[PDB]
Write a protein that binds this ligand. Structure first.
Ligand code: HEC
Length: 112
C-alpha cells in the first residue's frame, strides 16, 4: 500500500526531530535511515528509552505492520509490545490518517 512519493511529503512532519539521510545526525530522535525491517532501538549511538531496548530484546523488528501501529500512537505501542507497565516513549507525536501512515511507510521502505 502506499505511494512513497506522497510518503516523502508526509515525512516533512517528522523532520524537526529526525533526519533520513544515511549517516545523518541524531537531532531529537534517532536518524531513521535503515529503519525498515531493522530492530527497535536500531541506532547504537542514540540513547533510547528503556522500553525500546526491551522491544529489541523481545526481537521486535520494524515491519510494515509494527510501523503502522507505532506511528499511530507511540506510547500505547511501547506499553503493549514491551510488556513493561512503567514504559516511557520520548516520541509522542502521532499520525492519525490512514492514508498518511501507509504512504510514510512506503517511503521508509526506500531508505534501505
Ligand atoms: C513522523 C511521522 C515520524 C516518524 C516516521 C518517526 N518519528 Fe520519531 N521519535 C522521536 C524520539 C525522541 C524517538 C526516540 C524515543 C525514545 O527513545 O523514547 C523517536 C523514535 C522513532 C522511531 C523508533 C526508532 C528505533 O530505532 O526504534 C521511529 C520508527 C520513529 N521515531 C518514526 C521523536 C520524534 C518527534 C519529536 C517531536 C517527531 C515529530 C517524530 N519523532 C516523528 C516521527
Amino acid at each position: 500500500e502506499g505511494d512513497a512519493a506522497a510518503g516523502e511529503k508526509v515525512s516533512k512532519k517528522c523532520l524537526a526531530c529526525h533526519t533520513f539521510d544515511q549517516g545523518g545526525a541524531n537531532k531529537v530522535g534517532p536518524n531513521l535511515f535503515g529503519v525498515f525491517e531493522n530492530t527497535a532501538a536500531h541506532k547504537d549511538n542514540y540513547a533510547y528509552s528503556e522500553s525500546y531496548t526491551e522491544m529489541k530484546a523481545k526481537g521486535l523488528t520494524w515491519t510494515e505492520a509494527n510501523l503502522a501501529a507505532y506511528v499511530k500512537n507511540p506510547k500505547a505501542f511501547v506499553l503493549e509490545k514491551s510488556g513493561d507497565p512503567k514504559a516511557k516513549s520520548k516520541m509522542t507525536f502521532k499520525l492519525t490518517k490512514d492514508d498518511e501512515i501507509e504512504n510514510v511507510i512506503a517511503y521508509l521502505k526506500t531508505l534501505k
